Ligand binder design. Structure first.
Ligand SMILES: Nc1ncnc2c1ncn2[C@@H]1O[C@H](COP(=O)(O)OP(=O)(O)NP(=O)(O)O)[C@@H](O)[C@H]1O
Ligand SMILES: [Mg+2]
Lengths: 628, 1170
DNA sequence: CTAATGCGAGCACTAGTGCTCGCATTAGATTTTGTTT
């Protein structure tokens, strides 16, 4: 289908096509899955993406975009099950800060409204279907439920519209198949109730039967045209007046074909039944022998020309062996030369390379490859320079030019223009040590991150940074509580450490990563684990306080922004100013003979410390900045 | 019967012998496979009593080896056909060769399942899942199980979790259950093996260590190090005797010896070793001062003594930092935890099987286990009774032939034992193999299975199975055989290697090769003296030597029958232990014009084209993904630069990147280039969007390639061939996954994403096929059974994969699941005795196999062998190599070989005592060529180019200008009629509701057709009454020509009225009459369509004429219509063209004129004439 | 793992001064084999 589309060869396939790619069938199947799996992510959005749930006469592009954002939301927040059907309005937050306040913004409100509005037209027809279906006991009332589900969502009208759009764009064959689909479904239901209508059946089996029936469904044959290539098979296809015949895939095991003993009666069974006088269908031995007649009829079907081809490798690269008929043919015609078929033109004669230039697209395709090969100091055929020149004389030589620009393709980046960079990062670069470190790792990564603000798709998943924030915030909470009760880290007992750690984590859990620590029993245990960690850490810090001459001045002490300490400012020659704002984990003071002493302590979720090499290359700059 | 041949008497023995189970044991290249084939051919092409090919089961483990056997059998068979072209039997066999049972054992298993699905809980239409989809289902069920267990909240579950997970998450327990399950699947009875775990932990304080099974491996370990220490000190003692050697320290060494010997006397008493070993102290080394002592000798003795110390301290820390009573206590304490693990794993398996059954899929594992389930009827703890299916295969198969039998595990052996006929003493089992080539320990393929039968069988076939040894090699030149033999006499023993490499086992020349001057085995040792990864240096050395072999031509001897062949790239083969080195090797060899082929299974998704094409697919699925969108925009697909990108961002900073793009389009003017890029892309996006919801993933992918020319484009950049290949297989892989469980864009992408997210990968595509003339890179495992003229073996300095030895747990076939003592509350962990025991056991088992792996590798070569490795420093390593080889015995010290981490730790000291780097050792006919390579030694303007850049045609004249021009301007002469439907309807020139939703029948079409049926069946002899009409209708109701509802929907008056009409009367009174006239008419296409051609085929119009009658005036046409009326000029035009079609049909086909046409309407009995 | 670093102790030689001995910690090191169609 694809290749003949490209080479502009009209054809007719002696075979019906499956309906399994049609939106209707997938709508029915995935809706049933929505009911069966209890609104799983994959089921719900498989269903929605077929667009048959889309509000009537709303712009498909717009509805699509709204669905897309709802999908991203459902992934991010782990939406599944009765969460869809409960009615509890979907709430939406943009950023995760354990320190911050819950309070929403204008944007977040606007968004939340959009998400819920989309939800409110997605759920009802599906939820109603779930109602009726649970209620329905017999095949007929379940079929009634399903059909009314199709009818309420205005499926017939949506299909009709689709059909007219296809007709308008000239895709008439694609346009007819919509009605074909509807009729197939209706027929399936009709026969289902005709045979088993009054029988009481389970959703599981009803879905099984619908699934099997759908898996059988097929579109009618495209009616033949006046002038096409006939592509068919070697056991059922019939032809008349054929001049040229291409027999394909003369591989071992394929032609002659290995018989299929799939079935209730084995070869031995059929053989013995034959000996007692029962005549059934042929056996493996006989079919395998009849293959020679099939081959004979194929080989003797054209009047003028016969081609017999075979692939040496499958699409994965695995070796394919010639069938015996290739050798048989070599015997009957020992002075016949075997032709090579390849997509590497440099392996055949000039005259054979010329056969490649059949149309603009194919010629473009091959010319590009040949040009590459040519830059590898290969004397490519003159076929391709001629082809090239013609493509450059053509009216749309620009397209081919863009194609052949691949010759000089290097992954080059253009430095940002003054105006653009200034406008992008702003007059005053507000950033953090983190950002500068990213830049020092790779300028482009800094560009994608802080220039283009490219966010990666969010998941309902507890990652390391979130845990880190939990640890930090927990220690802070314990620290503040310690000052409130006139307690000091030295004066902590084992019981106190445990209590404070537990209470702190408990407070922070609802705030962390869209309440994921409350989302399951497995996560309840992750939460307990985190509590054990905070407890032991509290104990350790308690021991260290009892042995240090340093006392913490500040904990999570923010610099710049609106915190205590002022930012670290830099004057850039453009007039643009750079301002670095952030938060020091801990600062300790201690009196001494030399004077007042300050040290910086950072809570890291790793084992390693400070590498002076990384500091030199600007990969590790936080600590020394805080000390500075 | 004895016969003259090219066959050795041993070989002929194996070919003709019958009557019992037969095992053929022989070194590499002996003709084991050749013999298997010839045995078959002889059984098939016999004169006395020939058998058909389908009465044999020919089985091996690997798909490649099965392909080989298939190949050899085919060749030999048609070869026999040439000798006797008249035989119907032989041609019959070449036909049957398709249906022959010659394959992998897994393929056979598939056949068994397919036939006998009904004996087990299996759907006949079942499918084999691929690795990732199976494992994804496993991930789902494991998550489900874990959640359920957390919900129960049973104390034991938390007790297990706490011990085998980190402080942050429980993923490690996940991996643990997966691993234990997978391992258990290599046992004939997985759950029994799992349930045997606890018996290791069922100890007490009153137990004796030495009487526990695992202690065996402890017993060995101690024995090896103590002796190892003794052996060391003795050398330090012998050094005291040397002229330079330090005499005084003798009294030190003899003391140490006496202490170490004192330990040896109590090796069997663990409880005594606990008292004595930590109590051992070596008295301070006596200082030797003067110029009489060799400095080097002093230091050498010191080194050895310190070696002894280290050995003891290792022994002490391993076993004697804890009392035996304490060891037993920790062990026993671990017992409850193990029980929870066992029941957890068992649940997973059950739930896992359930999940797969639902989706009607199976593992590779389910192949073997379900096959075994089918083949058994009764199973009493190993004693398996054959079921009906088993009996079928026992009858069907006259003999079962197994090649590479040393790869047979206990599960496969169970299967073979069920498909074979008779006991060992009188069975039909023929097996060839070699214990030295046993290299599937990760599959639980046991050397013990081979060795047991080999020790049980006798050379005479009486009372038991017959064993047959083959001594002669017919594959390699003596250079290879000698290098191999010389190496493995020193490395492979019974202790390390698990096989005694004695005289019976050595390779013996039996192939005649005209000598070559350079065929000496080469050893290229590369150094790191004075930004390239070592694999690259290695690859450079390889390529250099390959081109050396190409510049001086090589001679390939078809010794089988007599003819030379010039060396092809085909002939050279590079062997590796594992493929993570392969890509970097291929890149460097490709960079030097050397064609490379390699079946890769990783690296696909890091190719930029793949990332880009995938990004497109993702954007089509959901554009609101900033990174894939940005990827597509920056890719050559669109060609937006960094400025244009930030420019898009400027339109909307806070929103998604897609929103910003839409905004740019909304505000931009059509004169901007950026606008044009983005608008073209957006149009494409929306098009593809609509497209994917109606077509498959693969159709979408091709359409994307078509609209973007990205595959074309990519074919024009550096690495174009590989890149185009990658995109091609993106299409084909989409095709396979669509067809399986991931139809449609959303499902497909989700599959790919989940695949990558759990570390699964796919291989980069291939360009040249395996058949073609290419240097093949392959694993040493894959090469087993095959032969090549030249062989490189690379990565000899690579460490052995010993990751398993460092976890907190360890799996053992014999002993089960060994673990550290772990206490989640006390926060302490330390190895138990069985863990240490298993670690020791496993280390020596692993080293043994790696040795065998090397043997397979070296024995692949026919004429040339290259050994390539890498080290930090040449001199230091040579020093290390000589400091192990002063011994005069062939076999290197056990402990030293035990200490090996790389292949060079083996080959090194074995090569040290050679002249090239005791006349028995140094005067071995082995020739080694040593190259001590260093890392460093291995490493305008064009008119047309600028013409291409400018988009200008290149200047010149070319031989194919006119033809290229003419073909690119050509159009098909008959293009306009290629889409015109041949068959046409007279009409040609609604979404209904289901039956069960509507009222009871009786529609317009129903009644109309019900009347039409009466009109074509009512007698026309005379005008009928109402009674006669009702009678006809009734007859049509009893002939089932008219349903009951059809019968009751009849207006008898309406039809009777027709016969009171004029046209009706003329109908009754006609010369000749006919009704329901079918017709086909051929109208030239121009009449229906402008632009058709006289040559172009006519269109075929088809219909059915209701009635035709002939009077003395002419021929008249009649038609009935149930059209609603109670209108004439409207009905006239409504059916005008139809009537014209009918008339033209009659006029043209019947060659008769038609005077007058009539249409009768049932409503009101109207008749209009045309 | 293993190799190097350093610090302190003792044992032995011809009380101090050498050098073996032992302990404890970083630093660098390392980069899987097969089973289907
Ligand atoms: N009697 C013989 N005379 C001549 N060539 C022989 C003879 N027997 C075997 N060969 C050839 O020697 C080579 C080795 O045979 P092969 O069947 O691969 O042995 P093998 O035991 O299977 N090797 P391996 O699988 O590695 O253990 C092949 O090329 C055979 O054709
Ligand atoms: Mg073999």
């Amino acid at each position: 289908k694809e290749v003949f589309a490209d080479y502009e060869i009209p054809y007719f396939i002696d075979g019906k096509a499956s309906m399994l790619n049609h939106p209707l069938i997938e709508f029915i199947r995935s809706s049933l899955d929505v009911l069966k799996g209890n609104w799983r992510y994959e089921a719900v959005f498989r269903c929605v993406k077929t667009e048959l749930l889309f509000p009537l006469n709303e712009p498909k592009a717009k509805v699509r975009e709204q669905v897309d954002q709802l999908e991203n939301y459902c992934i991010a927040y782990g939406i599944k099950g009765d969460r869809w059907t409960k009615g509890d309005r979907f709430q939406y937050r943009r950023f995760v800060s354990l320190d911050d306040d819950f309070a929403q913004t204008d944007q977040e409100i606007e968004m939340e409204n959009m998400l819920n509005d989309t939800r409110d037209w997605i759920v009802p027809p599906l939820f109603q279907l779930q109602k009726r279906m649970k209620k329905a006991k017999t095949v007929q009332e379940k079929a009634e439920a399903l059909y009314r589900y199709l009818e309420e969502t205005d499926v017939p009208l949506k299909l009709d519209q689709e059909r007219q759009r296809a007709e308008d764009d000239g895709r008439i064959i694609e346009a007819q198949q919509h009605q074909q689909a509807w009729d197939a479904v209706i027929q399936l239901l009709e026969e289902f109730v005709e045979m088993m209508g009054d029988d009481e059946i389970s959703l599981d089996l009803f879905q099984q039967m619908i699934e099997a029936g759908a898996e059988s469904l097929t579109f009618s044959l495209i009616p033949p045209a006046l002038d096409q290539v006939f592509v068919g098979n070697m056991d059922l296809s019939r032809m008349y007046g054929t001049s040229c015949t291409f027999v394909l895939g003369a591989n071992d095991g394929v032609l002659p074909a290995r018989p299929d003993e799939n079935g209730v009666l084995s070869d031995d069974d059929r053989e013995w039944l034959k000996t007692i006088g029962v005549e059934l269908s042929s056996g493996g031995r006989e079919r395998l022998l009849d293959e020679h007649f099939l081959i004979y009829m194929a080989f003797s079907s054209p009047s003028d020309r016969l081609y017999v081809s075979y692939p040496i490798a499958d699409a994965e690269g695995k070796t394919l062996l010639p069938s015996m008929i290739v050798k048989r043919l070599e015997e009957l015609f020992p002075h016949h030369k075997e032709r090579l078929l390849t997509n590497e033109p440099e392996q055949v004669s000039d005259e054979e390379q010329l056969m490649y230039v059949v149309n603009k697209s194919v010629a473009q395709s091959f010319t590009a490859s040949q040009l590459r090969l040519w830059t590898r100091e290969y004397d490519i055929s003159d076929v391709w320079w001629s082809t090239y020149n013609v493509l450059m004389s053509e009216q749309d030589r620009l397209q081919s030019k863009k194609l052949f620009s691949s010759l000089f393709f290097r992954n080059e980046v253009k430095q940002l223009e003054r105006s653009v960079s200034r406008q992008l990062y702003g007059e005053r670069i507000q950033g953090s040590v983190s950002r500068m470190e990213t830049f020092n790792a790779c300028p482009f990564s800094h560009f994608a991150s802080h220039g283009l603000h490219l966010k990666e798709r969010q998941f309902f998943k507890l990652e390391a940074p979130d845990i880190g924030q939990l640890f930090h915030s927990s220690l802070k909470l314990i620290s503040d509580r310690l000052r409130d009760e006139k307690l000091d880290w030295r004066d902590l007992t084992k019981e106190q450490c445990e209590l404070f750690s537990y209470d702190a984590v408990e407070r922070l859990a609802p705030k962390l990563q869209k309440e994921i620590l409350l989302s399951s029993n497995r996560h309840y245990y992750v939460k307990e684990k985190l509590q054990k960690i905070v407890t032991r850490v509290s104990g350790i810090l308690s021991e260290h306080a009892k042995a240090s001459g340093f006392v913490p001045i500040g904990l999570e002490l923010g610099f710049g922004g609106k915190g205590p300490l002022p930012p670290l400012t830099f004057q850039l020659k453009n007039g643009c100013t750079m301002e670095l704002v952030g938060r020091i984990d801990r600062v300790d003071k201690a009196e001494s003979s030399k004077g007042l002493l300050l040290r910086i302590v950072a809570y890291k979720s790793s084992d390693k410390g400070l590498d002076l090499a990384e500091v030199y290359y600007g990969l590790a700059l936080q600590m020394l900045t805080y000390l500075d | 019967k004895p016969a003259d041949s090219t066959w050795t008497d041993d070989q002929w023995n194996a070919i003709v012998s019958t009557g019992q189970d037969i095992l053929v044991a022989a070194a590499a290249g002996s003709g084991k496979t050749a013999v298997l084939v010839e045995r078959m051919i002889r059984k098939i092409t016999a004169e006395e009593n020939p058998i058909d090919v389908d009465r044999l089961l020919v089985v091996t483990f690997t798909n490649a080896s099965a392909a080989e056997m298939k190949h050899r059998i085919a060749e030999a068979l048609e070869k026999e056909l040439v000798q006797r072209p008249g035989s119907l039997h032989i041609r019959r066999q070449l036909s049957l060769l398709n249906r022959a049972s010659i394959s992998t054992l897994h393929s056979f298993c598939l056949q068994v399942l397919k036939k006998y699905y009904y004996l087990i809980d299996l759907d006949p239409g079942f499918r084999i899942a691929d690795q990732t989809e199976g494992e994804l289902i496993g991930d789902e069920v494991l998550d489900e199980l874990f959640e359920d267990e957390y919900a129960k909240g049973e104390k034991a579950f938390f007790e297990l979790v706490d011990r085998y997970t980190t402080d942050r998450h429980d993923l490690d327990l996940q991996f643990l259950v997966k691993q234990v399950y997978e391992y258990s699947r290599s046992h004939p009875n997985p759950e029994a093996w799992l349930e045997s775990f606890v018996h290791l932990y069922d100890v007490s304080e009153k137990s004796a260590i030495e009487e526990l099974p695992f202690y065996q491996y402890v017993k060995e370990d101690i024995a090896m190090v103590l002796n190892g220490a003794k052996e060391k000190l003795l050398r330090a003692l012998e050094l005291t005797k040397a002229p330079g050697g330090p005499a005084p320290r003798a009294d030190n060494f003899l003391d140490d010896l006496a202490q170490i010997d004192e330990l040896i006397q109590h090796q069997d008493d663990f409880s005594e070793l606990y008292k004595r070993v930590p109590a051992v102290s070596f008295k301070r080394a006596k200082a030797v001062k003067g110029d009489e002592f060799d400095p080097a000798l002093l230091d050498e003795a010191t080194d050895l003594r310190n070696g002894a110390k280290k050995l003891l301290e290792k022994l002490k820390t391993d076993y004697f930092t804890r009392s035996p009573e304490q060891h037993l206590k920790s062990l026993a304490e671990m017992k409850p935890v193990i029980e929870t693990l066992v029941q957890l794993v068992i649940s997973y398996g059950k739930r896992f099987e359930a999940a797969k059954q639902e989706k009607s899929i199976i593992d590779f594992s389910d192949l073997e286990h379900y096959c075994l389930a089918i083949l058994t009827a009764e199973n009493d703890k190993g004693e398996r009774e054959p079921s009906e299916a088993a009996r079928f295969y026992q009858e069907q198969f006259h003999e079962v032939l197994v090649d590479e039998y040393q790869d047979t595990n206990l599960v496969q052996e169970s299967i073979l034992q069920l498909v074979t006929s008779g006991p060992e003493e009188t069975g039909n089992l023929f097996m060839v193999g070699d214990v030295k080539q046993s290299i599937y320990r990760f599959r639980l393929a046991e050397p013990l299975l081979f060795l047991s039968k080999y020790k049980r069988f006798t050379e005479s076939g009486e009372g038991t199975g017959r064993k047959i040894d083959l001594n002669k090699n017919f594959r390699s030149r003596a250079d290879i055989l000698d290098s191999t033999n010389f190496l493995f006499k020193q490395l492979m023993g019974g202790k390390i290697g698990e096989v005694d490499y004695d005289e019976q086992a050595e390779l013996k020349l039996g192939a005649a090769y005209p000598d070559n001057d350079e065929t000496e085995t080469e050893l290229l040792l590369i150094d790191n003296a004075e930004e390239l990864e070592t694999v690259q240096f290695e690859a450079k050395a390889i390529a250099k030597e390959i081109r050396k072999l190409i510049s001086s031509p090589f001679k390939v001897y078809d010794g089988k029958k007599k003819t030379h062949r010039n060396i092809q790239y085909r002939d050279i083969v590079i062997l590796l232990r594992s493929m993570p080195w392969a890509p970097q090797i291929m890149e460097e060899l490709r960079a030097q014009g050397i064609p490379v082929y390699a079946n890769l299974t990783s690296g696909y998704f890091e190719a930029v084209e793949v990332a880009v094409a995938l990004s497109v697919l993702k954007v089509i699925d959901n554009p609101y993904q900033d990174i894939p969108l940005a990827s597509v925009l920056r890719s050559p697909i669109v060609g937006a630069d960094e400025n244009e990108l930030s420019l898009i961002r400027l339109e909307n900073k806070k929103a998604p990147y897609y929103e910003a793009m839409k905004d740019y389009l909304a505000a931009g003017d059509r004169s901007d280039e950026l606008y044009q890029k983005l608008n073209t892309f957006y149009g494409h996006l929306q098009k593809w969007r609509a497209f994917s919801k109606n077509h498959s993933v693969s159709e979408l992918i091709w359409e994307v390639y078509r609209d973007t020319k990205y595959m074309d484009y990519v074919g024009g950049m550096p690495g174009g061939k590989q890149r185009q290949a990658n995109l091609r297989v993106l299409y084909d892989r989409a095709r396979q996954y669509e067809s399986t469980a991931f139809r449609g864009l959303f499902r497909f992408l989700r599959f790919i994403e989940r695949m990558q997210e759990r570390g699964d990968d796919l291989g980069t595509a291939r360009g040249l096929s395996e058949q073609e003339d290419v240097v093949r890179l392959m694993t040493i495992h894959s090469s087993k059974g095959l032969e090549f003229p030249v062989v490189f073996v690379a990565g000899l300095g690579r460490n052995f994969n010993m990751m398993d030895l460092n976890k907190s747990y360890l799996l053992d076939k014999e002993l089960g699941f060994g673990t550290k003592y772990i206490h989640p509350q006390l926060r302490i962990s330390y190895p138990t005795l069985p863990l240490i025991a298993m670690k020791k056991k496993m280390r020596r088992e692993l080293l043994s196999e790696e040795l065998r792996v090397l043997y397979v590798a070296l024995t692949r070569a026919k004429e040339k062998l290259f050994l390539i490795g890498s080290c930090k420093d040449h001199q230091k390593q040579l020093a290390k190599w000589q400091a192990s080889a002063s011994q005069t015995d062939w076999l290197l010290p056990e402990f030293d070989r035990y200490q090996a981490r790389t292949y060079l730790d083996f080959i090194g000291p074995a090569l040290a005592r050679h002249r090239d780097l005791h006349a028995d050792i140094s005067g071995h006919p082995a020739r080694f060529a040593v190259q001590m390579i260093h890392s460093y030694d291995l490493l305008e303007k064009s008119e047309r180019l600028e013409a291409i850049r400018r988009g200008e045609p290149v200047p010149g004249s070319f031989a194919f200008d006119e033809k290229a021009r003419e073909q690119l301007s050509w159009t098909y002469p008959h293009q306009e009629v290629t889409q015109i439907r041949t068959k046409q309807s007279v009409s040609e020139i609604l979404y209904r509701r289901p039956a069960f939703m509507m009222k009871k029948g009786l529609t317009a079409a129903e009644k109309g057709t019900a009347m039409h049926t009466v009109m074509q069946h009512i007698p026309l002899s005379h005008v009928p009454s109402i009674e006669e009409a009702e009678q006809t209708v009734h007859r049509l109701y009893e002939k089932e020509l008219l349903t009951e509802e059809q019968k009751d929907a009849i207006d008898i008056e309406e039809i009777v009225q027709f016969f009171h009409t004029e046209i009706g009367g003329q109908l009754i009174g006609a010369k000749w009459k006919d009704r329901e006239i079918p017709f086909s008419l051929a109208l030239p296409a121009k009449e229906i369509y402008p632009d058709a051609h006289e040559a172009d085929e006519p269109l075929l119009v088809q219909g059915i004429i209701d009635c035709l009658y002939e009077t003395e005036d002419g021929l008249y046409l009649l038609a009935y219509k149930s059209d609603r009326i109670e209108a004439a000029p409207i009905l006239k035009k409504r059916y005008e063209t139809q009537i014209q079609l009918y008339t033209k049909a009659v006029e043209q086909i019947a060659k008769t004129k038609v005077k007058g046409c009539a249409l009768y309407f049932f409503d009101g009995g109207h008749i209009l004439t045309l």
